[PDB]
Symmetry: C3
Subunit: 114 residues, 3 copies
């Protein structure tokens, strides 16, 4: 799985352990080994949500399977919780786009997963 | 809706109110309330279009509905126009990817829109 | 086609001419003229892969057609090879997401390809 967070919070406010915390929590939530999880955090962005530049986040989660109606509601609770606690972002200023990837459409280690 | 602009134009050339303008224009074009519109502008990027590093942009628009043949032409005229007027990017050096998102695949405030 | 590379390798390690090389190699691999290829390289990113911050990359390739099972294997060998040779990134620390875009969902030059 790969998880991307784009946010206007400054780099100095991103805790040093945040990428490792996300990796472990996503491994538990998805049931996948941590070795397969990639995380990308992009702070200091020029962003607005609802016309306001108060802290916000635009996120994406891509996974081969483990995406769906009930699962995505659970992921949204987990991730809004982490963003609220660690980055101080209000949960109504977070969007998360979920992508169920076909194995033939994910490249890794010179090949694809198909 | 969520609109992202990645561009090699320098940050100093982005006008002060550009995020507000995009928000209002997108609200009018999509018919969705400004409260739910997120905009993200990423300048100073290392980009090329057709092998050249003249000003260019790669953009994405994600929406739950309001995506389709005729609507997307209208959005492209609006958005290429704004980027040409405000950032001085030629419209033939802009790509905009459009994504019709399933409501179950957009997380917000501890749930999804399904 | 549009190709995006996000990496934690520093900007100073990106060779002169890399965006040209990517444009030329992707034109050959996809069969599309170079004029319609856009490339975007994002170094110095805060990223982890498998809970480690050793060099890694998250990439996307979006094309109108020319995406599929066997083609994506060929692209992954090509692109993992280039990232390994030019940026010193191990292929097992690269994900590439492939997107087959409908022509009606790509805006360019004030219109769409539909």
């Amino acid at each position: 799985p790969m998880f991307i967070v784009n946010t206007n919070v400054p780099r100095a406010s991103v805790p040093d352990g945040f990428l490792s915390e996300l990796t472990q929590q996503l491994a538990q939530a998805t049931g996948k080994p941590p070795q397969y999880i990639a995380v990308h955090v992009v702070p200091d962005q020029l962003m607005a949500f609802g016309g306001s530049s108060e802290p916000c986040a635009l996120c994406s989660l891509h996974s081969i399977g483990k995406i769906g109606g009930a699962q995505n509601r659970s992921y949204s609770k987990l991730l809004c919780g982490l963003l609220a606690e660690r980055l101080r972002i209000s949960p109504d200023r977070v969007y998360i786009n979920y992508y169920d990837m076909n194995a033939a459409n994910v490249g890794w280690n010179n090949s694809t997963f198909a």
